[PDB]
Design a protein around this ligand. Structure first.
Ligand SMILES: C=CCO[C@H]1O[C@H]([C@@H](O)COC(N)=O)[C@@H](O)[C@H](O)[C@@H]1O
Ligand SMILES: C=CCO[C@H]1O[C@H]([C@@H](O)COC(N)=O)[C@@H](O)[C@H](O)[C@@H]1O
Ligand SMILES: C=CCO[C@H]1O[C@H]([C@@H](O)COC(N)=O)[C@@H](O)[C@H](O)[C@@H]1O
Ligand SMILES: [Ca+2]
Ligand SMILES: [Ca+2]
Ligand SMILES: [Ca+2]
Ligand SMILES: [Ca+2]
Ligand SMILES: [Ca+2]
Ligand SMILES: [Ca+2]
Ligand SMILES: [Ca+2]
Ligand SMILES: [Ca+2]
Ligand SMILES: [Ca+2]
Lengths: 151, 149, 147
């Protein structure tokens, strides 16, 4: 008897939380975030060298942007376009030249290379930047690019 | 069952406390909550058309204060950033008649003395000053972007 | 089965909320224990910074342990701007207290501090190295609140 009343009580509290949270999700993503599927991209709004950007994302409980589909890539591109700053992706071929992988060592399941890329220009481009047009280019990891993490 | 229900209650209570803490964190320092509405500034300026798209694409719309209370709330963000902001309303359809994005007429207004005056015959947008008063201004001007959710 | 169902929704809510919390904290917030530090990203004199935090429903950063100090230190380091803490010794020179009047339960003064240099340093700033220094309250420092 009393338990049925508690259940109905919990239903009302849960509905309130769901509604309140749905509103805050939109508020939170504006203007530096993008939701795509179950992934969320968020830019720090500034630029940093690869290693520093990687650390920022990992320490925050996530990792550098790792678009695994056209949909995620387009979502990420929106942030790049908004800030008008090419961003770093999480993938590199630092372990084995010519073989780009995710931080986990897994090979890419998606790529959107601009024509002729990756080309390891000057024999020293192991990181990846995404342009405002959504295309990718391998680039020197020492360069500073917009920091975007995924959660 | 009771041991489970009591567990569920514990989870809901935890969520209520964590969510309340999170809301304060989110709103600091670029948002304002007033009633069921939330105003949040992007912290930068854009022309009207661009600011409007930014808000719509984010799932909301440009700041649309409908009462003295909401206007005061929005004013706080303007004062904080010390940058006048665009409101969502315009009289682009019918000169002399300002409306919300849906097309409805204003239910509240806080015009500065003599405004709106369509200065130069080309002011169809609205800006809110640090004093909270409104002034119709050229939509091509860049103002603080503030959306409501 | 309503309990089972409702619990599924709640646990799905816990997952979504946990994800949004990490997103919220990047890159201007830091969580330590049940406390959350968040910087406004700009500087302000003590009084103004204090008002902002209280108006936001929190208070100025008040690290009460080495752990909390380390978390706050991350924000200062990331922003590369020293920040004001909530404590002052305005009521009784030499005795720093929290807004509530309670005396410190933790401190991390840099060597030689607090020295009330100039005869008027009643506020506290935390450097990028995590150490504290008493400073004039009229100076502008990074605004960091705790919730
Ligand atoms: C941007 C268009 C030119 O793009 C050329 O040069 C880029 C960098 O080498 C430029 O770096 C510097 N320091 O100039 C290469 O990544 C790219 O594949 C192409 O070979
Ligand atoms: C003290 C303020 C004067 O304000 C005058 O001029 C404003 C703009 O036209 C200024 O535009 C530019 N470009 O300066 C009008 O909105 C306002 O109603 C008044 O007529
Ligand atoms: C970075 C640590 C140096 O800290 C030195 O300088 C501080 C302020 O005087 C700095 O302010 C200005 N305007 O120079 C003193 O409070 C502190 O005891 C020490 O003498
Ligand atoms: Ca290589
Ligand atoms: Ca390479
Ligand atoms: Ca290249
Ligand atoms: Ca007109
Ligand atoms: Ca007009
Ligand atoms: Ca006017
Ligand atoms: Ca004193
Ligand atoms: Ca003193
Ligand atoms: Ca000192």
């Amino acid at each position: 008897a009393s338990l049925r009343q508690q259940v109905e009580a919990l239903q009302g509290q849960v509905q309130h939380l769901q509604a309140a949270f749905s509103q805050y999700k939109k508020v939170e993503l504006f203007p530096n975030g993008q939701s795509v599927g179950e992934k969320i991209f968020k830019t720090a709004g500034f630029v940093k060298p690869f290693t520093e950007a990687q650390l920022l994302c990992t320490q925050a409980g996530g990792q550098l942007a790792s678009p695994r589909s056209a949909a995620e890539n387009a979502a990420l591109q929106q942030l790049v376009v908004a800030k008008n700053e090419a961003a770093f992706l999480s993938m590199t071929d630092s372990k084995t030249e010519g073989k780009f992988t995710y931080p986990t060592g897994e090979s890419l399941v998606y790529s959107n290379w601009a024509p002729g890329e990756p080309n390891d220009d000057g024999g020293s481009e192991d990181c990846v930047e995404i342009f405002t047009n959504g295309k990718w280019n391998d680039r020197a990891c020492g360069e500073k690019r917009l920091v975007v993490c995924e959660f």
